[PDB]
Amino acid sequence: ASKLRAVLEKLKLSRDDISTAAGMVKGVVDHLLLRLKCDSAFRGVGLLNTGSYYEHVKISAPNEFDVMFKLEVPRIQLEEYSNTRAYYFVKFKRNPLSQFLEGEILSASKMLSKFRKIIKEEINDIKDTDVIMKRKRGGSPAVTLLISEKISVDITLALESKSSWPASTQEGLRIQNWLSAKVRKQLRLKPFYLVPKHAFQEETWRLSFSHIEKEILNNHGKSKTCCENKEEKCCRKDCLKLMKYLLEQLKERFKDEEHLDKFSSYHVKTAFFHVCTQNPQDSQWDRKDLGLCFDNCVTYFLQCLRTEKLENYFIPEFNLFSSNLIDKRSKEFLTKQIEYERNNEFPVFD
Ligand SMILES: O=c1oc2cc(O)c(O)cc2c2cc(O)c(O)cc12
Ligand SMILES: [Zn+2]
């Protein structure tokens, strides 16, 4: 459809002017890292080795950045919480970060408090940089920095574990018929991350594989040279852009009906990875079949909404569409709206 290409062109024109705000983001992040190194608890803090200071959770908000700070720690031991498959208490192999211990458990609350305090005091020194209260997110992102009242950056703290991935990830990352089993082995040799998120609960941590997700998106083809020359231009990243934008537009349209609050771009990204697994051939993502491919993604996301099943791509026992996480009527609301847009040629794209 031409409307899809027009939407993509709008998104690219919106993206070209960032190369100036990205420098500001890099400066502020570098400053806060050099500050956090001075603390006795955060000596090994840094940015995820993702080749970018930042990511973008929202494609329709080029002003909202998302950075993640990793903290290399002594050998970590993990305990599962209530068979959640994703949430864990952290212990230390043996006796630095000792100040944040609450018994045998590493306190997420205490560490986040010191993190935020260090932020507040080091941002009072900067210029046009205000800290705001976004603790309604359940510890992650930890902070939400504000520059010139037009730049918003969410900062999430993450613990790096160079151990083997937890057992819940054993049947995840099913990229064997798509990106090969060698690549899956290589990726699972990389470390994993733990972010402070609660379940009621007040001291749990959740698994994070944003680096692996970024690696997959930027190396997404069966052919190693996908999207490296003009003869192999597939439309996977364009379909993902279309899915993110559809969700963002629907969430902005119905921001006053609290039925689309708990949906995020992580859901469409998870579904999209599953569709990639289902459609492993690059020929199934020809740049000429953009409409058909996007329609495959939309219909698969609808299937996940109706059946209330959206497995985490790395932890398949974690149902992101769990009745414990999102109510059935909210899923049904999103299903109706997506069916409406699909039956009416997506009026949100006009
Ligand atoms: O790493 C993320 O993991 C998740 C896991 C979940 O189960 C979930 O429901 C949401 C997320 C999620 C949502 C975001 O907006 C984001 O920027 C990152 C993540
Ligand atoms: Zn490609």
> Domain containing 141 — which CATH number?
3.30.460.90
- Does the beta carbon of 199 lie inside 6 Å of ligand 1? no
Residue of 123, 125, 146 lying closest to 134 (CA atoms): 146
Same domain, 146 and 228: no
Q: Name the helix (H) or strand (E) containing 118.
A: helix 108-123
Q: How wide is the angle at C-alpha 319 spanned by C-alphas 277 and 193, nearest 5°? A: 80
Are residues 235 and 204 located together in one domain of the fold?
no
Identify which ligand lies nearest to the alpha carbon of 244.
1
If asked whether residues 198 and 288 sit together in one domain, one would say no
Give nearest CA residue, ligand 1 atom 4: 266
DSSP symbol at 107: P
- Exposure of 139 in the CB half-sphere (CA atoms within 13 A): 23
Cα(324)–Cα(320) distance, integer angstroms: 9
**Ligand located closest to 137 CA:** 1
Who contacts 53 (Cβ-Cβ below 8 Å, separation ≥6)?
22, 25, 26, 29, 47, 67
| Distances, alpha carbon 65 to alpha carbons 49, 153, 155, in Å | 17, 4, 9
* Method of structure determination: X-ray
Residue 147 near residue 28 (C-beta atoms within 8 A): yes
> For the chain, how many structural domains are there in total?
2
Residues counted in the chain = 350
* Integer Cα distance of 281 and 177 in angstroms: 9
Residue with tokens 């976004």: 134
Q: Is the CB of 262 under 6 A from ligand 1?
A: no
Annotated binding site: 50, 52, 64-66, 154, 197, 206-213, 220, 226-227, 234, 244, 265-269
**What single letter denotes the amino acid at residue 158?**
A
CB atoms within 10 A of CB 1: 14
> Would you say 107 and 92 are in contact if contact means Cβ atoms under 8 Å apart?
no
Residue 17, SS3?
A: coil
The range of the structural domain enclosing residue 306 comes to: 220-350
Is residue 175 in a domain?
Answer: no
Mutation test residue for ligand 1: of 266, 308, 325, the one with most atoms within 8 Å of CB: 266
- Among 208, 237, 271, residue at a domain's last position: 208
Which residue shows structure tokens 């603790």? 135
3-state secondary structure 47-91: ECCCCCCCECCCCCCCCEEEEEEEEECCCEEEEECCCCCCEEEEE
148: left (phi over 0), alpha (psi -120 to 50) or beta: left
What are the two backbone dihedrals, phi and then psi, of residue 236, each rounded to the nearest 5 degrees? -65, -55
> Any idea what the CATH number is for the domain that residue 329 is in?
1.10.1410.40
Residues in Cβ contact with 50 at an 8 Å cutoff, skipping those fewer than 6 apart: 210, 211, 214
